[PDB]
Amino acid sequence: MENFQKVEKIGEGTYGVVYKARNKLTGEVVALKKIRPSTAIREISLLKELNHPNIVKLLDVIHTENKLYLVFEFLHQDLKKFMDASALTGIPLPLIKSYLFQLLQGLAFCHSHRVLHRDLKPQNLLINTEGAIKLADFGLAVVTLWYRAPEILLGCKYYSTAVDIWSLGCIFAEMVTRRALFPGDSEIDQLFRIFRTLGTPDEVVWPGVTSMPDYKPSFPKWARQDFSKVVPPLDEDGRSLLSQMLHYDPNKRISAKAALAHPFFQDVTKPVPHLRL
Numbered sequence: 001m002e003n004f005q006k007v008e009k010i011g012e013g014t015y016g017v018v019y020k021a022r023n024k025l026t027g028e029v030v031a032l033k034k035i036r037p038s039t040a041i042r043e044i045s046l047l048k049e050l051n052h053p054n055i056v057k058l059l060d061v062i063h064t065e066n067k068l069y070l071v072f073e074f075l076h077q078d079l080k081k082f083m084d085a086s087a088l089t090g091i092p093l094p095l096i097k098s099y100l101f102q103l104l105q106g107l108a109f110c111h112s113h114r115v116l117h118r119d120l121k122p123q124n125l126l127i128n129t130e131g132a133i134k135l136a137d138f139g140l141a142v143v144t145l146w147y148r149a150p151e152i153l154l155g156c157k158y159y160s161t162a163v164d165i166w167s168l169g170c171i172f173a174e175m176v177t178r179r180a181l182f183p184g185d186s187e188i189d190q191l192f193r194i195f196r197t198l199g200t201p202d203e204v205v206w207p208g209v210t211s212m213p214d215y216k217p218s219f220p221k222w223a224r225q226d227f228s229k230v231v232p233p234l235d236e237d238g239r240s241l242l243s244q245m246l247h248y249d250p251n252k253r254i255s256a257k258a259a260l261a262h263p264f265f266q267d268v269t270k271p272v273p274h275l276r277l
């Protein structure tokens with residue numbers, strides 16, 4: 001825009017580009033997403049009221065010249081970069097726990113306001129020097145499929161808040177092991193990597209799964225893998241919580257509210273991360 005001086009591009013997606021920018025007048029530093037309807041723009045105006053310490057603040061929405069600009073408070077690093085920077089040693093468990101706890105608080109909040117994120121991934125989880133982590137780039141009602149819930153992959157038409165819990169469980173596992181849990185490179189490879197680890201779902205663990213849009217009786221039947229092999233460095237409380245975030249049945253999958261009460265968070269604290277900016 002004219003009122004903003006681009007400092008640098010900080011990301012690109014299949015629907016918008018995000019820039020670090022400075023308000024030529026107020027001098028405030030922000031993240032500005034540029035996109036090239038009515039229900040949508042109104043769905044966005046709603047996001048503006050969504051204020052929580054673990055949700056990136058949407059400051060302004062400007063629709064002009066066939067472009068839609070969203071102005072957000074700026075955070076200095078995303079979780080993908082922090083995880084890469086922490087690959088040699090790993091993020092200490094207490095910080096992993098703090099981040100997971102905070103993200104669950106953010107989801108508990110949006111979900112209670114009937115707002116779903118739909119596309120959680122390390123690149124849209126932002127952190128600051130104070131130890132906070134916040135949800136960014138909420139999705140409206142080469143793409144990474146790694147954090148996609150199985151019901152989406154199987155063609156469900158109506159997502160539930162459970163899709164966000166699944167994505168967060170995948171991210172939790174990745175922080176712990178320092179390797180993506182299900183790194184699929186296509187929708188079917190993504191689905192099959194999930195099946196190879198958690199077992200091919202059936203009517204027993206997921207009632208109604210065989211009648212889903214993209215379910216094929218021809219899917220291979222893989223046995224579920226021992227969970228202790230999936231995220232070895234994780235203690236039993238963590239594995240227990242993870243297994244609940246990764247239940248196949250969206251209705252059995254733990255809610256963010258319930259997850260916050262899990263024994264895993266009994267000793268949660270808020271550590272300071274070591275951030276190189």
Ligand SMILES: Nc1nc(Nc2ccc(S(N)(=O)=O)cc2)sc1C(=O)c1ccccc1
Binds near residue numbers: 031082
């Ligand atoms: N508020 C906000 N601040 C951001 N700063 C940022 C992001 C990454 C890095 S990096 N790669 O670690 O050097 C450094 C700063 S991004 C952002 C968004 O709201 C957003 C928008 C669309 C998609 C994803 C995020």
